[PDB]
Structure 1
Amino acid sequence: IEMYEWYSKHMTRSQAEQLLKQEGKEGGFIVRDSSKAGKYTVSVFAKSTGDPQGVIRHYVVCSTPQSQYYLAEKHLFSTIPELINYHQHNSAGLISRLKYPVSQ
């Protein structure tokens, strides 16, 4: 899961938003451990919602009982890198395609 630029394990939601907004890029995103237990959350910056300043959306990664992961239903993946790679190539019903990994 690490080795990937888009992963920041400790990053909190507040840290994500400031850095996403400081980046200002459409589809800027950060993958971080959720507030929850055993959950992952994808934070995406996008300007497609009616606010030209851009909004931050926090997408918690879903889990089937069969231990696959999904953000967009019908697109089940066995691995977070596999999930993220798909959503880096397909908007797939999200506020934006994951266009740009934001870090630090």
Structure 2
Amino acid sequence: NNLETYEWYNKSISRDKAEKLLLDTGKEGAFMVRDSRTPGTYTVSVFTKAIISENPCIKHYHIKETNDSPKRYYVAEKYVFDSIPLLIQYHQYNGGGLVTRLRYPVCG
């Protein structure tokens, strides 16, 4: 199911790099993702546009997993899915809370 292909996915990424990558572009609710190790989910680097004296906050959202049917992964005891992409696709569209429900998957 590897994602390594979503503007938002960033393999081997960390919490700092994603923010760094996000900071590079700095969009509204920049969306990024990074593999972890937990039950097998992925991380989501979300960045909020801003600068001046501050305002741009980058949040790393991990995709929780829940042996559902399928809705396994999620990032808010909410919309659960079987993959970050759908989990992201759902955020990217719908309105899965998040900085801004995946507004722009950052792909460093």
Q: Which runs of 5+ in 2 are unaligned?
A: none
Further displaced range: 8-17 or 89-98: 89-98
- In structure 2, the CA distance between the partners of 1:74 and 1:5, relative to structure 1 (3 Å rule), is closer
How much does 1:8 deviate? 1.3
Q: For each residue in 1:58-94, what CA deviation from the matched residue of structure 2 results, as whole angstroms up to 9, or x when unmatched?
A: 1111111447111133412122221110000133222
Residue 103 (structure 1) aligns with: 107
Is 1:58 matched up with 2:65?
no
- Number of residue equivalences: 101
- In structure 2, the CA distance between the partners of 1:47 and 1:25, relative to structure 1 (3 Å rule), is closer
| Among 83, 88, 96, the residue aligned to 1:79 | 83
Q: TM-score scaled by structure 1? A: 0.79
Residue 41 (structure 2) aligns with: 39
How much does 1:52 deviate? 4.6
Residue 91 (structure 1) aligns with: 95
CA contact (8 A) 2:41 2:73 kept: no
- In structure 2, the CA distance between the partners of 1:74 and 1:100, relative to structure 1 (3 Å rule), is closer
State the percentage of identical aligned residues.
Answer: 52
- In structure 2, the CA distance between the partners of 1:46 and 1:90, relative to structure 1 (3 Å rule), is farther
Q: For each residue in 1:8-48, what CA deviation from the matched residue of structure 2 results, as whole angstroms up to 9, or x when unmatched?
A: 111222111111112111111111112x4433110101259
After superposition, the CA RMSD in angstroms is: 2.2
